Design a protein around this nucleic acid. Structure first.
Ligand SMILES: [Mg+2]
Ligand SMILES: [Zn+2]
Lengths: 23, 159, 687, 224, 81, 620, 227
DNA sequence: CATCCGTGA
């Protein structure tokens, strides 16, 4: 997932793990 | 001043061309020459002579050699003339019609001078005619083509 | 324009305005991209026109400090060890320090991999620097971009020229009848939709007590009830269709901050700026020559690219010197066939159909008691009909406009509705149109790939795959490598993998190419949604591999190859196209440049009050301008009579244009032009 | 160098059916199955809704009190409604349902000679206190006929013209087995693939396709 | 030797240009005859002494210019500058 | 022709339609006929169809940079609200289809329509008044489509095979009607080299003389050829009476054919011939199989190998500067050379690695569109980027766009991309201003007479004398001589005159002087010929658009201005140089010239250059 | 409105105009009718030949101007109608100075040559010529490698068999404006045939043939259609 | 040949 914060549809992401801060 | 009026024309045309050559643009020398021709149509007044030509004034070759053709027949001193090269801007401003000049650039300057010299405009040009709404003095506008009578051949006749 | 249009426009960095600079004062230094703009202001998003570089958007992660400067977040590295502690830095403060790039490899604890890493330094200079000297590092790879910019998948594959247009055009997207989320995302599509305010977010947690198309009621945990009303079929500032629909069903458990109902251009709380179209990268009978676009008629028969457009028509009744304007159903010399769609007051009835020229609000005004024509006096004695003193001043439908009347707003001075001095009755009729997509409508993708619809073929004419499915959109191959925006190509590949679904081979282990691929993407369903964050996400090796993973259709056959291409059949000749064509799915947006607005013409009409020339604009029904540049073209040709006509009897010849209209309708010859009234003006201005 | 009258075989499935036609001329199979494909997708007669009316509604762009959907989304849901009518002239259907619960294509009441083939189709989720009285008009036609045409005829202000997708055909394709073995054994075998909407049979679709084409190719045979 | 000229390309301009001094001349040549033909039709209804009517067969609803341009090709007109 | 929307035209011809409505009694007067058109009664759509009958309209597309910016068309009523435009005139309007609009002006007076159909009709303005080259030629899909079939593929199926053993000759067909049936069965490739007997195509001039003795080829006379099926279909368009062309159709090849057709064959032939080419280009662009994939775009094999070589040659330069043996001005100057050399070797790595099947290269090398420098950027590497100063950055973008640029790379490329868009907007403003100055200065310049009669002209260098012998064509031949008219009889060494005076220089008339040996001709110029007002016709010579002597009355002054300003957008001296020349400014360079001819006396000093010249003829 | 059929003419070929077709049926009718005239009409042509003074192909025939190649080609253009399916054989022999044509051929019973004026080969003095021809029947076009064993291996030459009596067919689809609709299709069809059959008849046969194919489909129900 | 004001882009 990318933004697992609100209760959103699951959009899987090619990524290096981004945990600095939410937009 | 070194190589004369004809050489300076050939130099401009090819130096101009050289810029469009490098970037892959092909303009025929013809079109360039048309503009170049318009730059040298004026010669300056070295000595006034008997003429009414103010010294240090750029006047057309046609006018310069026709006034020096009238004064030569009059008996007075002809004005000494040296050829002069003009940039297209000031050349466009030095035009005979104040209408064409004012409708180009520096409109406040054109009118100030023209209203003082009492310059009368013969509405005979492209920019001149378009403004007043006359047919332009070129193409299908010239009297040669404009005044044409078309009639059926004597062979052609109602049935 | 869209939930993003607002968003983008709510945060803009303009150097224009009072206290700032003028457009002519700005040289070439003010406009270009400065080094300090990193993470603060976007280098991509800026207008194309004469305002370029003087207008920009704020970078995503940036914020404003109490002194009016722009701060930006960086992660703090103690000693080669990344710390979650974050401090916001200003422009000049960062220059005194040294910053590492976001994508630099980091230990699971927090340490760096290589001693020398990529380093950002004052004055836009960059060098390799030992790990002992590293002060800070970027928050995100996508730190330097703006909101609309980060919504461009595979941004780092498109040149800044087209990527610029890719950002600018998203702004002009149009809200469709219903909207789908893109198969290829970037992750930004969620937070953009929420922070737009044009969706409905739940304030406090609870359960949906009742849901209707009109409103949603939420039963909280403490007992209180908040009701969220749905904006239904409202006209935006730009005539687009702000229409909201409830997502949740009655009885759903909803937490705080969750989207319970989204608006236009939104699908399940995500920015839905377009549709997912089955693309084909090929020339086709020239109909897509020079950036034109061919569409499947399926997009017309299934309203896939159909939009609703609302217009507000206004008219008032004032107090005049000859009496007062009154809004009535009785208009002089009009049949009952024309008035048929009005009510008793003179207003059109809601739901009625209106075409151009028809009457919306019947108003008549007392015309001045001037001596009527002796020839019209004679004409009124024969038929014995006495003239009324009321002239028709009705509100008719403007040329081009048409649709269904979807509401009336009337304000009367009588009904105590407070009006400006002089006005009695004011009427507002609202008319919506259901514009399907047609020829000349400007479409675009996110990669600066624009163009208009050249032709929409019948569904059968369309180049189709082996299983019979016809493609939706046929883009031309020629206009791709030139623009350097081959991110539209990568979107097509990943777009196909997302539609078919895939499954990496786990037998004999996890393959070496899909080794950096996170676990959750090793198996995907048909019609799956994925994220390709800018400066992260998919890489060319994984994309190529995924093209091999493509799951077969219902008939048990794979349709595209490892190249991403497939074999098409020409729907016209039947024979198969000689070579494999690149097929996949692309996200295409409907931009707000529609022919139904753009088209305009005029025989005769209104004229300038001073120069006596035609007026200008479609709004005033004015004619085109034949400028100084166009008069040179005529002059060059030598078409004196054409040029003369345009500037005389076609323009401001007061007596000419009238006698030209008569010569035409009588079928005679065009008379000789006179004197341009404008020239008379000049000779008087000189005087 | 061989002569044999052709065949027209069949390998079935409920919704879709494979037709096998052989033996055909070399390089003829493609431009033959295509002429059927283009006849199917465009000019096969079917039936669908043309116009509707709702209680308390005068135009497409509004909401019924108590219902979750708006008329736009409701009309858009009814586009996937599958209908088959024998009445060559227009007929009127009905749908009336009140209180809580869901309404479907099953609650539609088709008169004599009209049949709904997909009753499980969702139309609208009527919450409590929500009432929905509708009135649908069904006609026979072919291809695709836009809504915009109904309105100018004289249709009263109550009516809401809806797009018509008459085409009962779903998806058509083909593949060809050409035996190019160097001999007088060179022929093509056609495998046509036709899937319908459960409005008509795949066979009945190929039959109306042929009847059309036969009548068209009969004008090339008539003398001057 | 070419293909049949369609619509506004007929009569072929090349053969039109053989019977005239320049492109510009042909314009006034034709147009002034187009004026004569349209006069004749408007005058004839109420006036005698009109210019000679169409020296060729008028096509159904044929434009006066299109009539003139054809009989120029028929050499049925005289040319004066 | 042009597609005019049914909605646009009705308001355009509104009083022309009202006229015929009361003619055919649909309306009782002019007031009611007006009401009919506004209500858009179904009657008027039949009436309007008759009104616009061969009544030309104008299509203007701004900016109007040259006179072909406004062209006439035969209006065609069309469903929809968009204007339909011919794919060829897009070269003239410089109009694409990314949302471009066009103004429409309807001529009323009898003279105006005459001017439109004759002077301004698009089918008459085929050539550029600036160069005489075709603008209405195959351009994008069309060129790639034709280039397809005229290509000769070595081992393709159906190819001609000599007889050997027990099997006779394979690949010889009786007629084009046969070869058509072969590819229909699947035996013949439309690109394969075969042998066919043709009956309706004139053979090459070199072969016609061999097979007929120039007995005059005739429709029916046969002859054998060695081409491909596609090259035959292509020559049926040119069509008869034109010598067969057995080559593959690069754009330059197609540019030659049309330019030849412009000369000899008449206008209505060219207009129809080029039309057939368009229809053929698109149908075959379709089945050309030209498609962009991630697979068709391949990164070089020695990608990392080559870049490691020059990065190693770079680190050597960095360490040579680290010791301070290299100047800072010299350090980057060498670093620029290293990576410039690198980028080249990457491009070479693509050409040979890329099949000629590759659609990315197929489009580039066929002159259809795109540069290989784009292909390099896409598949190889971006290379050097420009500084805000303009100088090339010492740091190189090693990544291609297929691989994905690094975050920092995208940033610096973007900077350059923007400043490019800014300048492209600023030059245009300068270009249009220069244009308007040029127009005003040459407005009184019109062709008023047929001949000045003066013998004055100017010398043109026809060709340069090769050192070993023979001759070398001058590079300025096309632009300085090819359209001129002679001012003096051109004689060789003999007393035999090759070209008379008063003769227009054509293509074969250059070769008559080129083979004769004469390398200098005197030609009548606009400069030399002197008349009262404007210029003469003869001096000016061949109008680049007609291919014939300029008509008396043409405003050659304005056309010249447009012809100079139109392509001014494509410059780097540059455009400021062009202004510096036409405005006669005392230049920046200010290079000195010799006052009197003589022996040069160089006496350089390190602080200053001084040049003395001893006069050749006495003098001081 | 029911569709029309038209004809513009020439001796060997003619153009056919079909209008107005329901929108989208021009192309639906286009390539399907072309591939029928070219492939689905039976005739007769030369399968293989045999020459007396030939043991290999590169050397020309003793006493003949033309090469071995150019004679095969001229023979390909020979139009012949055989009455029996089974392969027949005709002999053509001539000697001395002059020109050999298609009227010199000795044809079997029920086998007709339709262009007896066709040039074939120019013989000179002391020039002998004896040729055995093998005539079969079929459809369309058949390559030469498939006929490499149809003659005695003492100089048997495989020839490209052009069975089909229709030579070349092209088509264009323009749009005709019916009522207010400018969508309707107009089909133009160019058809050139041999000297064996008229184009006007070659279409009726090609038209009748296809009616049979679409019969199979129609037989099932004959539900609905309108003309 | 280099500055100061006014006029354009
Ligand atoms: Mg554009
Ligand atoms: Zn002269």
């Amino acid at each position: 997932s990318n933004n697992s914060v609100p209760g959103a549809p699951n959009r899987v992401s090619f990524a290096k793990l981004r945990e600095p801060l939410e937009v | 001043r070194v190589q004369g009026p004809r050489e300076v024309q050939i130099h401009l045309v090819r130096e101009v061309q050289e810029v469009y050559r490098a970037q892959g643009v092909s303009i025929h020398d013809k079109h360039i020459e048309v503009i170049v021709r318009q730059m040298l149509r004026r010669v300056t007044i070295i000595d006034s002579g008997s003429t009414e030509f103010l010294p240090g004034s750029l006047i057309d070759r046609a006018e310069f050699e026709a006034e020096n053709r009238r004064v030569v027949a009059e008996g007075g001193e002809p004005a000494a003339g040296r050829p002069v090269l003009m940039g297209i801007t000031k050349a466009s401003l030095a035009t005979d019609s104040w209408l064409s000049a004012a409708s180009f650039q520096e409109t406040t300057r054109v009118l100030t001078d023209a209203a003082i010299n009492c310059r009368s405009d013969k509405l005979n040009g492209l920019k001149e005619n378009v403004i007043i709404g006359k047919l332009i003095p070129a193409g299908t506008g010239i009297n040669r083509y404009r005044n044409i009578a078309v009639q059926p051949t004597e062979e052609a006749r109602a049935a | 324009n869209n939930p993003l249009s607002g968003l983008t426009h709510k945060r803009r960095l303009s150097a224009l305005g009072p206290g700032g600079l003028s457009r002519e004062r700005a040289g070439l230094e003010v406009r270009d991209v400065h080094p300090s703009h990193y993470g603060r202001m976007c280098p991509i998003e800026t207008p194309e026109g004469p305002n370029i570089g003087l207008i920009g958007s704020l970078s995503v992660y940036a914020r404003v400090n109490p002194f009016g400067f722009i701060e930006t977040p960086y992660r703090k590295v103690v000693d080669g060890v990344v710390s979650d502690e974050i401090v916001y830095l200003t422009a000049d403060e960062e220059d005194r320090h040294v910053v590492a790039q976001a994508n630099s490899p980091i230990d699971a604890d927090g340490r760096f991999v290589e001693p020398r890493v990529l380093v950002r330094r004052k004055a836009g200079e960059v060098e390799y620097v030992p790990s002992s000297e590293v002060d800070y590092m970027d928050v995100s790879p996508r730190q330097m971009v703006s909101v609309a910019t980060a919504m461009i998948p595979f941004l780092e594959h498109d040149d800044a020229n087209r990527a610029l247009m890719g950002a600018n055009m998203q702004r002009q997207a149009v809200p469709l009848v219903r909207s789908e989320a893109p198969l290829v995302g970037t992750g930004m599509e969620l937070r953009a939709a929420i922070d737009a305010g044009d969706v409905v977010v739940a304030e406090e947690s609870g359960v949906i007590e009742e849901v209707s198309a009109d409103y949603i009621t939420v039963m909280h945990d403490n007992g209180t009830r908040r009701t969220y009303r749905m904006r239904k079929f409202a006209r935006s500032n730009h005539g687009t269709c702000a229409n909201q629909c409830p997502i949740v069903d009655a009885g759903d458990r909803v937490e705080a901050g969750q989207v319970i109902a989204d608006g236009p251009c939104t699908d399940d709380g995500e920015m839905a700026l377009g549709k997912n179209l089955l693309v084909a990268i090929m020339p086709w009978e020239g109909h897509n020559y020079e950036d034109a676009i061919i569409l499947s008629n399926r997009l017309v028969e299934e309203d896939v690219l159909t939009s609703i457009h609302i217009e507000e028509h206004e008219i008032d009744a004032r107090d005049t010197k000859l009496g007062a304007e009154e809004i009535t159903r009785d208009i002089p010399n009009i049949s009952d066939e024309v008035l048929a769609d009005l009510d008793e007051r003179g207003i059109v009835r809601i739901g009625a159909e209106v075409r151009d020229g028809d009457i919306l609000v019947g108003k008549v005004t007392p015309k001045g008691e001037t001596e009527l024509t002796p020839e019209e006096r004679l004409l009124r004695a024969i038929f014995g009909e006495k003239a009324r003193e009321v002239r028709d001043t009705s509100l008719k439908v403007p040329h081009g406009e048409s649709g269904k009347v979807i509401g009336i707003r009337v304000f009367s001075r009588e009904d105590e509705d407070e009006l400006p001095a002089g006005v009695n009755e004011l009427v507002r009729v609202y008319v919506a149109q259901k514009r399907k997509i047609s020829d000349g409508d400007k479409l675009a993708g996110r990669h600066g790939n624009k163009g208009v619809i050249g032709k929409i073929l019948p569904v059968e004419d369309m180049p189709f795959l082996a299983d019979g499915t016809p493609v939706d959109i046929i883009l031309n191959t020629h206009g791709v490598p030139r623009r350097m925006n081959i991110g539209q190509i990568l979107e097509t590949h990943l777009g196909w993998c997302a539609h078919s679904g895939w499954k990496v081979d786990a037998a004999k282990g996890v393959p070496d190419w899909a080794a950096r691929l996170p676990d959750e993407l090793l198996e995907a369903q048909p019609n799956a949604i994925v994220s390709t964050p800018v400066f992260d996400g998919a890489q060319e090796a994984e994309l190529q591999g995924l093209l091999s993973c493509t799951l077969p259709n219902r008939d048990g056959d794979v349709l595209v190859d490892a190249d991403g291409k497939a074999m098409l059949f020409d729907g016209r000749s039947g024979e198969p196209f000689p070579y494999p064509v690149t097929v996949g799915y692309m996200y295409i947006m409907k931009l707000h440049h529609l022919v139904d607005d753009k088209i305009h013409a005029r025989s005769t009409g209104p004229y300038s009050m001073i120069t006596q020339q035609p007026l200008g604009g479609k709004a005033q029904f004015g004619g085109q301008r034949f400028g100084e540049m166009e008069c040179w073209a005529m002059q060059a040709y030598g078409a004196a009579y054409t040029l003369q006509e345009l500037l005389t009897i076609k323009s401001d010849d007061t007596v000419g244009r009238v006698k030209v209209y008569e010569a035409i309708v009588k079928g005679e010859n065009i008379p000789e032009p006179g004197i341009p009234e404008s020239f008379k003006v000049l000779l008087k201005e000189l005087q | 160098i061989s002569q044999r009258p052709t065949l027209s075989e069949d390998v079935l499935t409920d919704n879709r059916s494979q037709f096998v036609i052989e033996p055909l001329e070399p390089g003829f199979g493609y431009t033959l199955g295509n002429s059927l494909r283009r006849t199917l997708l465009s000019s096969i007669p079917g039936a669908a809704v043309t116009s509707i009316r709702i209680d308390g509604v005068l135009h497409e762009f509004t909401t019924v009190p108590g219902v979750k959907e708006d008329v736009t989304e409701i009309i858009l849901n009814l586009k996937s409604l599958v209908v088959s009518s024998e009445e060559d002239e227009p007929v009127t259907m009905y749908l009336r349902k009140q209180g809580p619960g869901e309404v479907t294509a099953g609650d539609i009441v088709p008169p004599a000679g009209v049949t709904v083939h997909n009753p499980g189709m969702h139309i609208a989720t009527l919450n409590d206190k929500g009432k929905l009285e509708v009135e649908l008009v069904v006609e026979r036609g072919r291809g695709y006929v836009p809504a915009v045409q109904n309105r100018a005829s004289g249709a009263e202000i109550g009516r809401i013209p809806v797009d018509s997708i008459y085409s009962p055909v779903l998806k058509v394709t083909y593949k060809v087995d050409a035996t190019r073995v160097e001999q007088r054994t060179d022929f093509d075998k056609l495998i046509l693939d036709v899937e319908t909407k459960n409005s008509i049979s795949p066979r009945d679709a190929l039959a109306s396709a042929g009847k059309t084409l036969v009548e068209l190719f009969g004008l090339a045979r008539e003398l001057n | 030797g070419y293909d049949t000229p369609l619509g506004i390309t007929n009569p072929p301009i090349d053969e039109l240009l053989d019977r005239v001094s320049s492109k510009y001349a042909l314009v006034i040549y034709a147009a002034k005859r187009a004026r004569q033909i349209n006069d004749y039709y408007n005058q004839l209804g109420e006036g005698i002494l009109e210019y000679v009517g169409p020296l060729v067969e008028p096509g159904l609803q044929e434009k006066p210019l299109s009539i003139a341009l054809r009989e120029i090709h028929a050499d049925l007109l005289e040319h004066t500058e | 022709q042009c597609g005019l929307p049914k909605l646009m035209a009705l308001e355009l011809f509104k009083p022309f339609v009202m006229k015929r409505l009361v003619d055919l009694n649909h309306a009782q007067n002019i007031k009611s006929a007006k009401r009919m058109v506004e209500r858009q009664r179904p009657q008027v759509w039949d009436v309007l169809e008759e009104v616009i009958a061969e009544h030309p309209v104008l299509l203007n597309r701004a900016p109007t940079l040259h006179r072909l910016g406004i062209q006439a068309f035969e209006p065609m009523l069309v469903e929809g609200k968009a204007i339909q435009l011919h794919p060829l005139v897009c070269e003239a309007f410089n109009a694409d289809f990314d949302g471009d609009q066009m103004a429409v002006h309807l001529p009323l007076s009898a003279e105006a329509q005459a001017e439109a159909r004759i002077l301004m009709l698009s089918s008459n303005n085929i050539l550029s008044p600036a160069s005489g080259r075709p603008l209405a030629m195959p351009r994008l899909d069309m060129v790639t489509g034709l280039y397809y079939l005229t290509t000769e593929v070595p081992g393709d199926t159906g190819e001609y095979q000599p007889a050997s053993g027990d099997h006779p000759e394979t690949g010889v067909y009786s007629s084009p009607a046969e070869a058509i049936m072969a590819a229909d069965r699947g035996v013949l490739s439309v690109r394969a080299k075969i042998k066919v007997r043709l009956t309706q195509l004139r053979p090459p001039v070199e072969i016609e003389a061999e097979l007929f003795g120039h007995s005059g080829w005739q429709p029916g006379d046969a002859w054998m050829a060695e081409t491909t099926l596609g090259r035959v279909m292509f020559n049926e368009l040119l069509p008869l009476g034109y010598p067969f062309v057995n080559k593959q159709m690069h754009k330059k090849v197609q540019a030659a054919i049309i330019n030849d057709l412009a000369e000899r064959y008449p206008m209505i032939v060219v207009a129809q011939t080029v039309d057939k080419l368009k229809d053929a280009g698109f149908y075959w662009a379709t089945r050309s199989g030209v498609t962009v994939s991630m697979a068709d775009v391949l990164v070089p094999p020695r990608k990392k190998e080559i870049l490691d070589h020059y990065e190693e040659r770079a680190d050597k330069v960095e360490k040579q500067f680290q010791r301070g043996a290299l100047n800072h001005d010299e350090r980057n100057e060498a670093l620029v050379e290293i990576w410039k050399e690198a980028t080249d070797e990457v491009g070479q790595a693509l050409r040979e690695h890329y099949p000629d099947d590759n659609p990315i290269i197929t489009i580039v090398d066929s002159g259809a569109t795109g540069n290989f420098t784009q292909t390099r950027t896409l598949a190889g590497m971006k290379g050097l980027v420009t500084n805000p100063k303009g100088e090339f950055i010492p740091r190189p973008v090693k990544s291609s766009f297929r691989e994905g640029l690094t975050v920092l790379e995208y940033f610096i490329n973007t900077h350059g991309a923007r400043k490019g868009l800014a300048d492209t907007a600023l030059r245009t403003a300068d270009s249009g201003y220069l244009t308007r100055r040029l127009v005003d200065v040459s407005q009184d310049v019109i062709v008023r007479e047929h001949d000045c009669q003066t013998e004055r002209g100017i010398v043109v260098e026809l060709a340069e004398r090769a050192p070993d012998g023979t001759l070398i064509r001058d590079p300025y031949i096309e632009t300085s001589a090819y359209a001129r008219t002679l001012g003096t009889d051109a004689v060789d060494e003999a007393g035999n005159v090759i070209v008379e005076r008063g003769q227009d220089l054509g293509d074969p008339e250059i070769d008559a002087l080129l083979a004769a040996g004469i390398t200098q001709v005197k030609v009548r110029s606009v400069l030399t010929c002197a008349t009262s007002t404007g210029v003469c016709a003869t001096c000016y010579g061949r109008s680049m658009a007609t291919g014939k002597l300029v008509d008396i009355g043409e405003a050659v002054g304005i056309v010249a201005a447009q012809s100079i300003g139109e392509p001014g957008t494509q410059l780097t001296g540059g455009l400021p140089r062009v202004q510096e020349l036409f405005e006669a400014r005392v230049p920046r360079g200010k290079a000195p010239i010799a006052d009197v001819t003589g022996r040069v006396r160089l006496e350089d000093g390190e602080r200053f250059y001084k040049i003395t010249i001893v006069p050749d003829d006495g003098g001081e």
